[model samples]
Target: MLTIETSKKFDKDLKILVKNGFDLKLLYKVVGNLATEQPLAPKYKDHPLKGGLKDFRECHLKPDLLLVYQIKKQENTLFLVRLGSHSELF
Candidate 1:
């Protein structure tokens, strides 16, 4: 099992998104995958980065939902960083 933690940015984003009607089921589904250390399928667009956030990774929870997280298998930790959207999208 993985230990999970949430950053202040992630908490803020989750609060606002909930007010905006983002279904938490989607969030939970992803969390469930992450909680059990399950690998995401290709369609989720999961991938790693190579620059400033080289240690972190990003994935899609919906068409425009963004999830940035950190995984440390050695410590079995999952750090939830932030979630974004078109406002922060391309």
Candidate 2:
């Protein structure tokens, strides 16, 4: 399992998403699966980013809801940089 770390930005984004009636249970399940399953799980729809976020990876909590994260292979950690809908993210 990987260690998950949340950013202050992500914490704030989560609040907005929750306030806007996004599914909290789904988000928890998604995050739990991410922590326990393969780091590169097919279910994650994992992919690299470009431009300014070239070093990070982008994955899905849902089709429209995205999770931005980075893997620290040596330390077995996943840093959750951000989370929200497409427009909220970009």
The most accurate candidate by TM-score is 1
Q: Report lDDT (CA) for all predictions.
A: 0.81, 0.77
- Candidate 1 per-residue lDDT over residues 1-90, each given as its tens digit: 689889998999999999999999888888779879788766677777446345888788876788888888778888888898846733
Clashing pairs in 1: none
Per-residue C-alpha lDDT of model 2 across residues 9-79, encoded as one tens digit per residue:
99999898888888888767767766775454455576787754446878877777888877776787777
Cα deviation at 86, candidate 2, in Å, is: 2.4
- Count of backbone clashes for each model? 0, 0
Clashes of 2: 0
Report how far off residue 41 is in candidate 2 (Å). Answer: 8.1
Question: Which regions of candidate 2 deviate over 4 angstroms?
Answer: 39-44, 52-54
Question: Which sections of candidate 1 miss by over 4 Å?
Answer: 86-90
lDDT of 1: 0.81
